[PDB]
Ligand binder design. Structure first.
Ligand SMILES: CC1(C)C(=O)N(c2ccc(SC(F)(F)F)cc2)C(=O)N1Cc1ccnc2[nH]ccc12
Ligand code: NI
Length: 278
């Protein structure tokens, strides 16, 4: 819209403190912190606070709240929970459940120096729970990667979005035609060719996340450039079975990377498929 209309999700600047720093978000810096009177039965609650650039335009501020207004509808334990908005005041804030172990790509890379089929299959099921929920509330994530999946103190996996502007995952984006950043290494053929983002194109990215878990977050298509990735995937090229990859997990990957998007499974079908095995 041209406007944002404050509602009861609003929470006073007073009750938000910020501790350390979490990363460069799209509209501003993101910080860890603490928040009061936002989950009653808890006096203080540990949160993540994303912020709007002091510089950044008003129509950019509207653009920022309206994306977090989408999260007010949501109620899935495998999607990072919205706790509040702080629109009235200078630094324009959104508060969120704090996922203590940060993003799934750092967690998998932290295990390099195997994990069990079981334990991998689990993560796959928890990611697919969130994603099934999202596709059902008519949300297409269009940047599902392990770096946007978030981990909890208990090692539970929740779907998130940390945007494209973190220095730490710069190799993971290509300014194609020199326009906006594109996570080309994760993108369906149809998303690469024609710019078509669907439930189905999320199921392609989910197959790359499976590949990330199996490899412990190796760079997909290592030793190809972004232009070479484009060509390879647009021509029906696929990823190699990771070394030591269980059969059951690589078969999900293939299913998810059908060229024809209507050949691929729904998240709902993926959840079914794993759930027979537990
Ligand atoms: C930047 C911020 C804070 C955020 O805004 N989001 C977010 C945005 C949209 C949805 S909606 C969905 F899932 F895409 F459908 C969910 C989460 C995050 O994940 N973030 C990161 C985040 C949340 C929590 N703990 C963290 N630790 C380390 C980082 C981190
Ligand atoms: Ni669960």
């Amino acid at each position: 819209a041209d406007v944002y209309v404050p509602d009861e999700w609003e929470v006073a600047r007073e009750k938000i403190t910020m501790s350390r720093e979490l990363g460069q978000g799209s509209f501003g810096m993101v910080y860890e912190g603490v928040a009061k009177g936002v989950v009653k039965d808890e006096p203080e609650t540990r949160v993540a606070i994303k912020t709007v650039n002091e510089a950044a335009s008003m129509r950019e501020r509207i653009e920022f709240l309206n994306e977090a207004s989408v999260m007010k509808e949501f109620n899935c334990h495998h999607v990072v929970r919205l706790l509040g908005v702080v629109s009235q005041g200078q630094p324009t804030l959104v508060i969120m459940e704090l996922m203590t172990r940060g993003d799934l790509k750092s967690y998998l890379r932290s295990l390099r120096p195997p994990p069990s089929l079981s334990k991998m299959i689990q993560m796959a099921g928890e990611i697919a729970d969130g994603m099934a929920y999202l596709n059902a509330n008519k949300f297409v994530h269009r940047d599902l990667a392990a770096r946007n999946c978030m981990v909890a103190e208990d090692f539970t996996v929740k779907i998130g979005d940390f945007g494209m502007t973190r220095d730490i995952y710069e190799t993971d984006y290509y300014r194609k035609g020199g326009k906006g950043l594109l996570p080309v290494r994760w993108m369906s053929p149809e998303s690469l060719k024609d710019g078509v983002f669907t439930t189905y194109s999320d199921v392609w990215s989910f197959g790359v996340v499976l590949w990330e878990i199996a490899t412990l977050a190796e760079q997909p298509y290592q030793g190809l450039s972004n232009e070479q990735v484009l060509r390879f995937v647009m021509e029906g090229g696929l990823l190699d079975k990771p070394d030591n990859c269980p059969d059951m997990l690589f078969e999900l990957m293939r299913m998810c990377w059908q060229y024809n998007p209507k050949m691929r499974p729904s998240f709902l079908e993926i959840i079914s498929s794993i759930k027979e095995e537990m």
